[PDB]
Amino acid sequence: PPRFQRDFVDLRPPIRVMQWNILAQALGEGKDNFVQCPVEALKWEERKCLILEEILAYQPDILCLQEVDHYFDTFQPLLSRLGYQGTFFPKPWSPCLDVEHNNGPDGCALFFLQNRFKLVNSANIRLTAMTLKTNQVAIAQTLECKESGRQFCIAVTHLKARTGWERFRSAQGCDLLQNLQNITQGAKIPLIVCGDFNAEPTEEVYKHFASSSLNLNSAYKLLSADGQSEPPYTTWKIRTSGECRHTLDYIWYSKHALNVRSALDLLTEEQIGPNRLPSFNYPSDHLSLVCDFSFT
Ligand SMILES: [Mg+2]
Ligand SMILES: [Mg+2]
């Protein structure tokens, strides 16, 4: 398992944030076409256990998830027993509903440790594209640290997928930024944004986040030598369409208000295996991103 191989890179009451597209069960079996992954490795009982194990390994204070189609039967009750408050917001027209024997819609989930934070406000945002209501969503919550009293905003999203939706993703991202501008009262409140943006760093939506007056940096850039380059991948798998290896996942943070203390490194080509992800020992086609933050 990758959790025995991946290390925290030392980059400096810390707040640990975990970002993960966990792979919806209905999509893994019905839409993704993982041609080199054993079908037995895609079974829900096996996947469920590995996803929980990942969360237990990294002990996050905040967990931001995409492609969650087992929130009500699994993640909400189990994480509640471990002290996490959860919020779930489904895609209005989830692709999971196209799959036989699905478990309902997928969507975003946001969990936080109740004993660490008080919930100040919350918003379930249906993203718009130049006012067009889209099929993608975000959750944004303002939390208050119970030890320091410091407030901050955490948001999670999953943007429109696939080639041909670059301008659409850009419009979505712009709407999200506008919403966060309002919630954080014009960057008065520190911000962390987790997501599968379905976009590599060359896309306009990435450039919008990097140039926003919210003054956001991308945390996993700090793994690079000069701190100026995004990782080579956050997802790596083989589909009927071909092998996909790219960077689509990000943790954005207020550069002037938050410091990154650590980041969980990626797997090497040798460690990940020729058949890539998911596998018998890893439940998603995306690696989890995990960072420790501290207030400046
Ligand atoms: Mg997926
Ligand atoms: Mg709106």
Curated annotation (Swiss-Prot):
**Leader sequence residues:** none
Annotated residues for binding of substrate: 67, 91-93, 135, 158-161, 196-198, 286
* Cofactor binding note of this UniProt entry: Binds 2 magnesium ions, but the ions are only loosely bound to the protein.
Give, as one word, the top-level EC class: hydrolase
Outcome when changing residue 32 to A: Lack of catalytic activity
Record keywords, A-Z: Biological rhythms, Cytoplasm, Hydrolase, Magnesium, Metal-binding, Mitochondrion, Nucleus, Repressor, RNA-binding, Transit peptide
The entry lists its GO molecular-function terms as: 3'-5'-RNA exonuclease activity; metal ion binding; mRNA binding; NADP phosphatase activity; NADPH phosphatase activity; poly(A)-specific ribonuclease activity
Asked whether the UniProt record includes Hydrolase among its keywords, one would answer yes
GO CC terms in record = cytoplasm; mitochondrion; nucleoplasm; nucleus; P-body; perinuclear region of cytoplasm
| One of the GO biological process terms | regulation of embryonic development
**What broad class describes the main subcellular location of this protein?**
cytoplasm
Record: residues binding Mg(2+): 67
| EC number of this enzyme | 3.1.3.108
Q: What is the effect of changing residue 196 to A?
A: No effect on activity as transcriptional repressor
Task: Spell out the subcellular localization from the entry.
Answer: Cytoplasm; Nucleus; Cytoplasm, Perinuclear region; Mitochondrion
* Disulfide links within the chain: none
Which tissues express it?
Adipose tissue. Expression is higher in subcutaneous adipose tissue as compared to visceral adipose tissue.
Region (Interaction with PPARG) spans which residues?
215-225
What this protein is reported to do is described as: Phosphatase which catalyzes the conversion of NADP(+) to NAD(+) and of NADPH to NADH. Shows a small preference for NADPH over NADP(+). Represses translation and promotes degradation of target mRNA molecules. Plays an important role in post-transcriptional regulation of metabolic genes under circadian control. Exerts a rhythmic post-transcriptional control of genes necessary for metabolic functions including nutrient absorption, glucose/insulin sensitivity, lipid metabolism, adipogenesis, inflammation and osteogenesis.
How does this protein assemble? Interacts with PPARG.
The Swiss-Prot or TrEMBL record describes its family as follows: Belongs to the CCR4/nocturin family.
Protein's UniProt name: Nocturnin
Q: Which organism is it from?
A: Homo sapiens (Human)
Part of the full-length chain shown: 122 to 424 of 431
